[PDB]
Symmetry: D3
């Protein structure tokens, strides 16, 4: 069964402590899949989207001038943000903020070759009141064909 | 007074392959936090709730006769389900089905001891068409005080 | 040209204990506004709509053969149900059930007389687990022109 | 049946005219439950949340430095706001505003002692266009364990 | 069958190229229904609502000082915006923008005379990243009694 | 390198009266884009998805054994359904039913040729009470890369 958990990889990259992630990186290298990681502190959801788009482009995971790529990523991002926000994608507008780690992974996860590329966006972090220590954890995942 | 990623432990339990998670089981022994794990396959959301209620009651993670317990858990469940369903909380009614693992972890994560117990619910798995193999991954996490 | 809290009258009717609401009944006699009251126990949302449609038609609060009437009422119903369900409009499908009282009040609340008739729908009751006693209160109000 | 309608109390406090609320206050006094009341005019939802948090803290209904308290209240607040907004928690962003009265009540409503404390957040008021008299009534309720 | 597709008229006005719309205009003239058209480029949803309200008033399709009229239109507008936004009515807050054509049509579409007036709001256009050519089409319709 | 309103073609197909749409059929012959058309009457949303999946597979608009195809289509379907349902994606469960026409169009709309194929799903019809004649129009459009 050649099939791979591309989401789980993204999530693991997002949640494991730096330096615990070695095997995942190794797998990605073998596979020769593109990926990136990053962090964002946000009281506005669009900041999250921006950070992710920016990161994806800078690390060459997506072609920023090619809409199909950016449409695919956009919607995967919203899917993840939804796991984090659980209903309303409002942060500041609802008196909360988030600090999040993110990761993106673009690959060919399925067994059949024709399935082609897919992208995964993962978010992990905390969400809470804009006060130190009044917070808890959150998670999200988005998957899209690309 | 150390503070813990209770969400990440639950997430890790739901997503890792069995026998790969021993460390997390060990952290929990040490803390002496209660917890359970499960699998559920659903085309009806209410099924997901029921399986987790049954497994939390069965492994003594919560008290099925105390409403404050079951209330705390119910909302953690819906939060995790939002991550999985990403908006509309519907499965069969939107012609999709879910194949999931879950974990619930109850404990006292915060440094401060007056922060009491908190509970976490995690889901990891696949969501897709009724036909098998046409599907992708999904995830969710709910946190509540308890 | 006095202006009235038609929503509050309906709310009061749905929430007060019987025999405790006589004043509100009296205000309504005076205005000569039509109105009805009801009870519904539901694990299916559509049941809530149906019971209120039946009781508004039956006490001549609206005309079941005039779509503008039934349209105005239907949207007032969904507005009140959002208050009760607080997001996802699902009951059994999210493993909860509702025990509710309702009231509909139709009248001309505004100072201005060209503001026509308006209708109000109120819900008050309990929402909880299928087991009895594991539940809490809930409420909702929908307003529409009619 | 020692059980009490803590939500109905909050709602009544929120909706009754000043000086009609005497009995409710009396009950609360007997019970020795903590509570507060207040008003907020808002074109931004976060204003509502802020007002309520602030009020709860100032009147000593909740411990503002204790997350479990503030998590409990936060989520009860969002539940109420939902009854008021009926779908989207957007005010200004959707060209409406709200004027609302609020109330919070913290108590031990259930018969069994072990159920412990619960909190209720109630909203009542009007919502409408940012123009005088283009408005109608709205209501909300949130209940949480605390 | 005297009944008319008032929504389809609004939608057609919104989507057809200028000068392809002649027959629709003709029908409207015969019927002596009021209507208007317009365009709005928005990164904020309230801009859309504002544009539509403004246009409706200026062209005398609705009485801006009469709430029933403006309530009816408001809710029809939100219904259309929903088709355009598909879930969250957020534009800038979610890193997208929209360019849209709109139309409103007020008439007596049904066969029975007593059905009275109804209003239709239609939106057609593109939605996308705030970059040229990274965009796709969108549509919406709202219908309300008036 | 001309760019096309693929959404509008699909919309037009779903909403025009048969025999009135010949031009659009002709544009499609010219482009050589695949497409299908359908009717569905539903009180269950999943029925809408199924009918469109069946008609896209049947007229070779997509490949039922390739997940990337069916994934792209599924999300375009839910987008169009949001336009029709306007929030809650429920029909019977909210005591309403839908009478709809649909169309799917797959092609390469953009000027740029590397923008690949994209798919469009359109719905037009009526939504209302179970009784016939108590209903109004509705619409929706979903777009995805494919
Ligand atoms: N607990 C909130 C975040 C928060 C806001 N204020 C306090 N906490 C959530 O689930 O998103
Ligand atoms: N891709 C869908 C699931 C699905 C239904 N049919 C095919 N796929 C989702 O993200 O939930
Ligand atoms: N507490 C849930 C209802 C419930 C389901 N199970 C237990 N309680 C609500 O707020 O709707
Ligand atoms: N009627 C709107 C408020 C409003 C905005 N503009 C006019 N009225 C509501 O239900 O929230
Ligand atoms: N494709 C998005 C719009 C967008 C934002 N960024 C890129 N595209 C939508 O469906 O609304
Ligand atoms: N008017 C409702 C449908 C309906 C149900 N009952 C009567 N009408 C809608 O907009 O979806
Ligand atoms: Mg899109
Ligand atoms: Mg998907
Ligand atoms: Mg929380
Ligand atoms: Mg609850
Ligand atoms: Mg309204
Ligand atoms: Mg309607």
């Amino acid at each position: 069964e050649k099939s791979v958990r591309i989401g789980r990889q993204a999530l693991l990259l997002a949640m494991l402590d730096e330096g615990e992630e070695g095997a995942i990186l190794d797998e990605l290298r073998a596979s020769n899949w593109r990926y990136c990681q990053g962090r964002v502190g946000a009281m506005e959801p669009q900041k999250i989207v921006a950070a992710i788009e920016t990161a994806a482009k800078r690390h060459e995971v997506v072609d920023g001038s090619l809409y199909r790529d950016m449409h695919a990523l956009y919607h995967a991002i919203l899917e993840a943000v939804h796991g984090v926000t659980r209903g309303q994608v409002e942060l500041g507008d609802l008196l909360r903020t988030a600090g999040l780690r993110f990761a993106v992974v673009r690959g060919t996860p399925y067994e059949q070759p024709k399935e082609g590329e897919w992208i995964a966006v993962a978010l992990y972090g905390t969400i809470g009141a804009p006060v130190r220590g009044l917070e808890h954890e959150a998670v999200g995942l988005g998957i899209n064909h690309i």
